[PDB]
Amino acid sequence: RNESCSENYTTDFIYQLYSEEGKGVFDCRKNVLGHMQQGGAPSPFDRNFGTKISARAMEWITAKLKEFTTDDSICVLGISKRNVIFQPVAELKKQTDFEHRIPKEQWWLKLRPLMKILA
Amino acid sequence: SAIGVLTSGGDAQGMNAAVRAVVRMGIYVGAKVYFIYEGYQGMVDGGSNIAEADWESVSSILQVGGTIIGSARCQAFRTREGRLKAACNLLQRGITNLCVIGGDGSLTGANLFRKEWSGLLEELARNGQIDKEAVQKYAYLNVVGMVGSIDNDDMTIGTDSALHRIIEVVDAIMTTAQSHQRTFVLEVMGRHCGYLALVSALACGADWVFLPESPPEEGWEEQMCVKLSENRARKKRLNIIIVAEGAIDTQNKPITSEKIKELVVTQLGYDTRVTILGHVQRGGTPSAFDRILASRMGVEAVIALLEATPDTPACVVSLNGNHAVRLPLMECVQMTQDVQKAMDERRFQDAVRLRGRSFAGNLNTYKRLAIKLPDDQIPKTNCNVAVINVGAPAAGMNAAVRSAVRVGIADGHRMLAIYDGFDGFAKGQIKEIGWTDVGGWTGQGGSILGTKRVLPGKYLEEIATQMRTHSINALLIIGGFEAYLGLLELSAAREKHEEFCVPMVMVPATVSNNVPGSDFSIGADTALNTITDTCDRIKQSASGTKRRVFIIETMGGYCGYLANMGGLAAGADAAYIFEEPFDIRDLQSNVEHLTEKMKTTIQRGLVLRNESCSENYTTDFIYQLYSEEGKGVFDCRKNVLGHMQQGGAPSPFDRNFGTKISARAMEWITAKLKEFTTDDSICVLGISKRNVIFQPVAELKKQTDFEHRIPKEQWWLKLRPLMKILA
Amino acid sequence: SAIGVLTSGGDAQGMNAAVRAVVRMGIYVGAKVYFIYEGYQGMVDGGSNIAEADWESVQAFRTREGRLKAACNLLQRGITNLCVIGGDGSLTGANLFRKEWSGLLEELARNGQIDKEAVQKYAYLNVVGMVGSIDNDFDMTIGTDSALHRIIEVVDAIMTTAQSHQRTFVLEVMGRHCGYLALVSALACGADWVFLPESPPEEGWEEQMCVKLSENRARKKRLNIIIVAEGAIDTQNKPITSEKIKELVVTQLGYDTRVTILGHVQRGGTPSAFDRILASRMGVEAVIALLEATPDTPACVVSLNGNHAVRLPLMECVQMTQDVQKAMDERRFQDAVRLRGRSFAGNLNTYKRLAIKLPDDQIPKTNCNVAVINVGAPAAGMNAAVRSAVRVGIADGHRMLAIYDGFDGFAKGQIKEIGWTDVGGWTGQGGSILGTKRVLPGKYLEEIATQMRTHSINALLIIGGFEAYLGLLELSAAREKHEEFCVPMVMVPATVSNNVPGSDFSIGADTALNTITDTCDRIKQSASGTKRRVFIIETMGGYCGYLANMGGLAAGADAAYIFEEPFDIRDLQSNVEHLTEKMKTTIQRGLVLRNESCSENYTTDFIYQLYSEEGKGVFDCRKNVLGHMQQGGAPSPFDRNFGTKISARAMEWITAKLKEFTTDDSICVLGISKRNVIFQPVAELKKQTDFEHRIPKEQWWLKLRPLMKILA
């Protein structure tokens, strides 16, 4: 359960519902993982990820300084599809759900049917 | 096919609950229900005075006193012309079923209307309506009566409420009569029945009462004045004299309140004041008792109406003490006339008989608690009887202690008070208590002796020693489930400790009503009335906000009594209890139902939840479900009443309950002492069916859910379908 | 040095609170306080009739011989300050006693006292009086509100039975010389007629009254209530009995009439929240007056003048009684009613303009449409307010419009023209018949404007809480874009919380206070014998500490935690320890009130746990969250009258504005400040508002905070 997926249907709520309706068949246990999810040592992927984009970003900074500013001077360097691209924050505003602080369009949602399939 | 409902004669609080129950139960079984306004006069007048009732009509009337469809003394109904008119107006609407809620003769009018139904042939002779109407509606006039007056001609609608009003007045007066040593003469409503007066006097520990059934004997004036002078000797700052309006001599002369005042002033020179309560007795909000009674009665009235046949006589739907019954009408009218006949020829004693066992009992208890004999006249047993309070406090415990102590003293016992339950018992907190010590206790809430939850198990030695050092020959416990457990434990401890081989009896006192062997417990009624009041207020709030459902958490532990009865009297939409399992579908069902309800004009919801009804489906849970599924239709609020729902000072019912039941317990103790171990020496005195019975605790074990501290079978569960039907 | 307190003539509820306040405030200022039992007679008798008061305690005087006795007994105890709480004539004895204090010299002439008491003991007899009667010929007095509660309780009960037939009830209430109680009762129950000792009925009143009743039956009002003061009189100072009124109605109209003489219940019952608080404040002010007294300062009577403690010189009060009586004998009844004060005349005029309607033809119809609405959470007295507003509006020749379900229904066009009969019987109804919502008008500005255009709303009156104020602000802002809002707008404060800026009181708050006190009384009754308990009770009010504070005060709470006064764990600990010591005494109970929003971390649960744990060997706790029941059932009499009057005033303002496109003074809040009801432009109130916590920046009742600890 995502922590903020529902205001009323909390972790406790879901636990109670499953517990009660499952009584003669199964019992439940509830766990809230917490800040341990920030991890200990970074995964190899995260190490390389940080390393790489930071290197490229700094390249961009150096290119910009080698030339007072506009809108393309303030960017987010992100991964889109197969490339890492620079996006002015102004373009990203319309691409943002500021109320819930999530992107309006998220690729991985397309993988949702897989859960049920892989049971 | 169609039911007509009306209210006739003196207006009772809870008449609206009755009308509501009749309408809703009627619609429920698929019948057409019609209001008949202005009692019988509406029936005669016709037109606008007979209007069809829909579900919404009877909403927001339950908590209101009087009768929303009104009442008027019809004269035209006493004439054949008017009964013809009424018959006509009824036939026009196809009404052939009648539910009459009201006083004494208001029913006789319906009974006579029943016997005299052949006015239709007359109107056929007088072609006022065509034939084939004749044969279709003729011998098919169904009649059911509901006693809805305070005259009480069993329990009638409004009596508890009126009693509430009276005792409210008395309690209010007690706060002002510290200003000098004043005597208050209160005239309450009784022209022929002295029930209201008797019960008022018993509920307030009145110094004197005057009844039409039992006139005072010569020379009562001297005795009454000596009693009052004794009270000032006892330095009691107050005096209360309850007077039925129809108070009479042995010579059928009325005894006015002014006459009483004149007597007190002339003989004792006391500051005496008269108050004629009057119609306030009829007003105010119906108590939980009257609401529930009226509801059950209205429903039973509809059922009776359906099950009736042409051979079936007109009946009065009644409560013969906590189960629904149908009494033949003519028999009742004949009883009233029997009593009347007895009063006129001065057969006052059989009149008191004719009133019933309840009456004579209330009266005997009042007498033996109000009048004390001098010690020289008390044979005196050399026995020591102990009184104790065990468990949580319950409103009416002090009344119980007062009763027990005074009855014990009258029976020649030396009474001993044990303070702070078994905690104080083990600690030797024992003091011989007297007649005066318990004075004025009746209306006191909480526990003056003190009560604790602690069981005797760990201190069997310490208590035994005490029982031996004080020579306790018998024990009466006033308390809840813990009292019962205590009795069980002492019963077990008997063999090792001879001190426990004495007769022991308990009377159930708890807001929860979870003591096995009793249909009712002292303190519960007060809690119900507080709960109902709070729900009235909440219901009002939702009514002004609109599109609101309140989830209200009640007390009771695992016992669903308060949640259920409270829900019933409050007009709750649902009441979730442990005794009745509920799953997510039931909850969703109620959600959908409330959704539908929000389309109507009554855009409010009231959901009660017994505190321990579910481990998973908590108050929060239910609130979240209702909130989420109600989105766009209604929103919720959660309220946890907390222990304050238990109330403050005991309700009149709880006062009298404690008084009477404790008096009886003491009677049992004296009888037992008038002779060693076995099992019936340790009992629970409880209410079962129409009777009060003594039950050995050992027998009650098999009837107990010790895991949840509730009786295995609880009568009121049979009333569960009513909630849904009336909401 | 030593204070003597006694009661003479008193029959009012709240006297004990007064006596308590005197004792404790007295001990607090370092004085010795003594009870004097049996009034002045106790002072004369001496001995046991005068007993020293400690924290837990909580014919002859007309002969010179007896005053000598009394003087002696006081001197024995060093008692030199007298506080007399009681009736009319009860103070004059103390005043003359003061002036006659040279009885001390007489006692030196005899051997009753040495000389060093004369000089140590003359010229300081300081006397202070407190009105503790309900029929006060000699402002608001202790017991008035409580009596009003009693009467209105009776009336409310009778009203449900007066449907059994169309009964007309003639109710005899307490007024032998003062007609305040009768008038105010009538205003509180929407009585069909009232009879007062100061203002006799005018010419052909019998016919007028019968016409009124017949009109009520025409409009199908199922009942009639006539309030009669005990000393009801005609223009010839002969009495107008209730019996006579009944005879009149029976003879002329043939209605089912009943007489009810309320009597001593009026004097009984529990003191109201108002009376408890008033009495406490009075006792405190009395002790203060006693200390601040000089030999030159005359004996005074402590009073409350517009939510302020005042000291009135006694002789002025008796001179008032004598002036009024003189006017009564000389039949200058208007001069008498005049002498009663502005409040009286106001109550009377409002009652009249609400009880008696002129036929439409005699009402110059202004072609204006005035809208009435309820905004925010429900408050007891909203319906009374709507009734008043509507009827005054109609009387002023307006077409009244009712808007249902606040701005929600407003936006939905839930608008229906309302009439005189429609609001009948509303006075004693709790909640909101129109319906009320917290939703603000901001997001439905177009939708509302359209409605104001389709219905031609020329003015708007809002009965509501903080949300109403916010709404007014929003509409004020919306004016330029929507011309429909360029109409006069006024609000009257209605909320249990009393958090509306520009008002010292709001409709519904009093009912709530009485709910808190009632609940605390019942809690006290229940488990009365249990001992070593502290109750933690959570009240409403939002961030506003009014309910928690005043409720605590009237309840005799040991603490009241509010947002307006920050508290940390040390403060909590201090109170816990204080209660621990308190459990050593004879009063082994604790009562802790908590404003729901007083702290983010220090919740009701938190406080309960701290008290429970630190109190383990000494006491245990119980927790209660009162909930929406604090909105009340039937509105208290005070809230009923408050709604009625304030709304009437508001409507007067509206008609005045229409008798004259708008600015800032066209959108106001009508609130109570000190002693006056004033109209304040919302823009001006902005500077006085904490919009973050929805409470006023400055709240009067905060000066009463030290009282809590003092009164323990």
DSSP characters over C235-256: TTS-B--HHHHHHHHHHHH--E
Q: Select from C461, C417, C409, C458 the least CA-distant residue to C438.
A: C409
Sign (positive or negative) of CA dihedral B337, B342, B348, B349: negative
Could you tell me if B694 and B683 are in contact, meaning their C-beta atoms sit under 8 angstroms apart?
Answer: yes
CB-based burial, B295-313: b 16+ in 10 Å, e otherwise: bbbbbbbbbbbeebeeeeb
d(CA C341, CA C699): 28
Q: Is C233 exposed, middle or buried (0-12, 13-18, 19+ CB in 10 A)?
A: buried
Tokens of B629: 């599924």
Q: What is the dihedral of CA B421, B422, B424, B428, to 10 degrees?
A: 130
The residues after which chain A has a C–N gap greater than 2.5 Å are 67
Could you tell me which chains touch chain C, where touching means 3 or more CB pairs under 8 A?
A: B
Question: At B114, is the secondary structure helix, strand, or coil?
Answer: helix
Residue A13 and residue B624: Cβ atoms within 8 Å?
A: yes
One-letter identity of residue B453: R
Q: What is the dihedral of CA C355, C360, C364, C367, to 10 degrees?
A: 110
Flag whether residue A107 sits within 8 Å of chain B, measured between CB atoms. no
Q: What angle do CA C424, C426, C427 make, to 5 degrees?
A: 115
Could you tell me if B349 and B360 are in contact, meaning their C-beta atoms sit under 8 angstroms apart?
Answer: no
Q: What are phi and psi of C281, to 5 degrees?
A: -55, -40
| Cα separation of the two ends of chain B | 22
One-letter identity of residue C706: P
Could you tell me if B657 and B525 are in contact, meaning their C-beta atoms sit under 8 angstroms apart?
Answer: yes
Could you tell me if C658 and C488 are in contact, meaning their C-beta atoms sit under 8 angstroms apart?
Answer: yes
Other Cβ atoms less than 10 A from the Cβ of C299: the count is 25
d(CA B578, CA B710): 10
Which residues in chain B have their CB less than 8 angstroms from residue C378's CB? 540-541, 544-545
* CA distances (Å), origin C555, targets B265, C39, C590: 39, 27, 11
d(CA B620, CA C336): 62
d(CA C665, CA C119): 63
- The verdict on whether C521 is a catalytic residue reads no
Angular region, A76: left φ>0, alpha ψ -120 to 50, beta rest: beta
CB-based burial, B528-544: b 16+ in 10 Å, e otherwise: bbbbbbbbbbbbbbbbb
Q: What angle do CA B421, B427, B428 make, to 5 degrees?
A: 90
Strands B384-390 and B451-452 turn out to be parallel
- Determine which of B169, B184, B240 to mutate to test the interface with C (most C C-beta atoms within 10 Å): B169
CB-based burial, B76-106: b 16+ in 10 Å, e otherwise: ebeeeebbbbbbbbbbebebbbbbbbbbbbb
One-letter identity of residue A13: F
Q: What angle do CA C464, C465, C467 make, to 5 degrees?
A: 100
d(CA C554, CA C692): 29
How is residue A71 annotated by DSSP? Answer: S
When CB atoms are compared, the residue of A8, A12, A17 closest to B584 is A17
Tell me how the structure was determined.
X-ray
Ligand-binding site membership of C24 (annotated): no
d(CA A37, CA A39): 5
One-letter identity of residue B31: A
Flag whether residue C633 sits within 8 Å of chain B, measured between CB atoms. yes
One-letter identity of residue B316: V
Q: Select from B363, B708, B724, B413 the least CA-distant residue to B557.
A: B708
Q: What angle do CA C337, C343, C346 make, to 5 degrees?
A: 80
d(CA C51, CA B661): 43
Question: At C171, is the secondary structure helix, strand, or coil?
Answer: strand
When CB atoms are compared, the residue of B621, B627, B628 closest to A16 is B621
d(CA A55, CA A64): 14
Max intra-chain CA distance, chain A: 73
Which residue is catalytic, options C135, C192, C396, C405? C135
Give residue for tokens 């609020």: B637
d(CA B11, CA B226): 39
Tokens of C21: 């306040």
Max intra-chain CA distance, chain C: 93
Q: Taking the CA of residue C482 as centre, how many other CA atoms within 13 Å lie in the half-sphere pointing to its CB?
A: 20
When CB atoms are compared, the residue of B177, B282, B543 closest to C161 is B282
Residues of B within the annotated binding site? 10, 73-74, 103-106, 149-151, 182, 189-191, 245, 273, 279-282, 453, 510-514, 548, 555-557, 611, 637, 643-646, 709
Count of CB contacts below 8 A, A vs B?
Answer: 27
Flag whether residue C11 sits within 8 Å of chain B, measured between CB atoms. yes
List Cβ neighbours of C322 (8 Å cut-off, separation of 6 or more). Answer: none
Q: Select from C587, C430, C454, C443 the least CA-distant residue to C514.
A: C430
d(CA C111, CA C260): 59
Flag whether residue B581 sits within 8 Å of chain A, measured between CB atoms. no
Nearest-Cα distance to chain A for B584, in Å, is 8
Sign (positive or negative) of CA dihedral B659, B664, B667, B673: negative
Flag whether residue A10 sits within 8 Å of chain B, measured between CB atoms. yes
Estimate the crossing angle of helix B220-233 against helix B257-268, to 10 degrees. 60
Q: Do chains A and C touch (3 or more CB pairs under 8 A)?
A: no
Flag whether residue C239 sits within 8 Å of chain B, measured between CB atoms. no
* CA distances (Å), origin C466, targets B547, B605, C388, C627, C642: 21, 26, 21, 19, 18
Angular region, C632: left φ>0, alpha ψ -120 to 50, beta rest: left
Q: Select from B301, B338, B342 the least CA-distant residue to B318.
A: B301
d(CA C147, CA B294): 34
Strands B384-390 and B414-418 turn out to be parallel
Question: At B635, is the secondary structure helix, strand, or coil?
Answer: strand
Q: Which of residues 321-380 of C touch B (CB under 8 A)?
A: 374, 377-378
Q: What are phi and psi of B455, to 5 degrees?
A: -85, 150
Strands B50-52 and B97-102 turn out to be unpaired
Q: Is C154 exposed, middle or buried (0-12, 13-18, 19+ CB in 10 A)?
A: buried
Which residues in chain C have their CB less than 8 angstroms from residue B544's CB? 374, 378, 382, 431-433, 435-436
Flag whether residue C628 sits within 8 Å of chain B, measured between CB atoms. yes
How is residue C616 annotated by DSSP? Answer: T
When CB atoms are compared, the residue of A6, A8, A20 closest to B616 is A20
Ligand-binding site membership of C427 (annotated): no
Could you tell me if B505 and B684 are in contact, meaning their C-beta atoms sit under 8 angstroms apart?
Answer: yes
Q: Select from C276, C305, C311 the least CA-distant residue to C290.
A: C311
Flag whether residue B168 sits within 8 Å of chain A, measured between CB atoms. no
- Number of H helices and E strands in chain A, helices first, is 4, 4
Q: Select from B129, B123, B84, B99 the least CA-distant residue to B8.
A: B99
d(CA B143, CA C166): 27
Helix residue spans in A43-88 (DSSP H): 44-65
Residue A20 and residue B584: Cβ atoms within 8 Å?
A: yes
- The helix (run of H) or strand (run of E) holding residue C672 is strand C667-673
d(CA C93, CA B220): 45
Tokens of C106: 């007489």
Which residues in chain C have their CB less than 8 angstroms from residue B643's CB? 622, 624
Q: What angle do CA B144, B146, B148 make, to 5 degrees?
A: 155
Residue A8 and residue B616: Cβ atoms within 8 Å?
A: no
Residue B642 and residue C631: Cβ atoms within 8 Å?
A: no
Give residue for tokens 């024990």: B475
Could you tell me which chains touch chain A, where touching means 3 or more CB pairs under 8 A?
A: B
d(CA C133, CA C113): 37
* CA distances (Å), origin C586, targets B424, C54, C467, C521, C556: 18, 12, 47, 19, 16
Q: Select from C399, C438, C405, C397 the least CA-distant residue to C422.
A: C399
Tokens of C549: 């504070």
Flag whether residue A5 sits within 8 Å of chain B, measured between CB atoms. no
Could you tell me if B576 and B622 are in contact, meaning their C-beta atoms sit under 8 angstroms apart?
Answer: yes
Tokens of B253: 């002369």
Could you tell me if C654 and B666 are in contact, meaning their C-beta atoms sit under 8 angstroms apart?
Answer: no
One-letter identity of residue C478: A
Q: Select from C368, C373, C365 the least CA-distant residue to C460.
A: C373
d(CA C240, CA C209): 14
d(CA C133, CA C146): 11
How is residue C111 annotated by DSSP? Answer: S
- Domains recognised in chain B with CATH numbers: 1-161+285-342 (3.40.50.450), 162-284+343-374 (3.40.50.460), 375-525+649-706 (3.40.50.450), 526-648+707-727 (3.40.50.460)
Q: Select from B412, B408, B403, B413 the least CA-distant residue to B438.
A: B403
- Determine which of C150, C151, C155, C160 to mutate to test the interface with B (most B C-beta atoms within 10 Å): C160
Tokens of B519: 């249909």
d(CA B676, CA B499): 11
Q: Is B601 exposed, middle or buried (0-12, 13-18, 19+ CB in 10 A)?
A: exposed
Flag whether residue B180 sits within 8 Å of chain C, measured between CB atoms. no
Could you tell me if C491 and C462 are in contact, meaning their C-beta atoms sit under 8 angstroms apart?
Answer: yes
Angular region, C463: left φ>0, alpha ψ -120 to 50, beta rest: beta
Angular region, B440: left φ>0, alpha ψ -120 to 50, beta rest: left
List Cβ neighbours of B193 (8 Å cut-off, separation of 6 or more). Answer: B151, B152, B153, B212, B213, B244, B355
d(CA B282, CA C61): 47
Other Cβ atoms less than 10 A from the Cβ of B251: the count is 7
How is residue A67 annotated by DSSP? Answer: -
CB-based burial, C530-566: b 16+ in 10 Å, e otherwise: beebbbbbbbbbbbbbbbbbbbbbbbbbbbbbbbbee
Question: At B688, is the secondary structure helix, strand, or coil?
Answer: strand
Could you tell me if C373 and C363 are in contact, meaning their C-beta atoms sit under 8 angstroms apart?
Answer: no
How is residue C190 annotated by DSSP? Answer: T
d(CA B319, CA B14): 15
The nearest alpha carbon in chain C to B278 belongs to C260
Other Cβ atoms less than 10 A from the Cβ of C424: the count is 16
Nearest-Cα distance to chain A for B615, in Å, is 8
Q: Is C256 exposed, middle or buried (0-12, 13-18, 19+ CB in 10 A)?
A: middle
Strands B97-102 and B2-8 turn out to be parallel
Q: Select from B561, B511, B565, B572 the least CA-distant residue to B538.
A: B572
Q: Which of residues 19-78 of A touch B (CB under 8 A)?
A: 19-21
Residues of B within the annotated binding site for Mg(2+)? 104
Sign (positive or negative) of CA dihedral C667, C671, C674, C678: positive
Give residue for tokens 């009755």: B18
d(CA B208, CA C679): 59
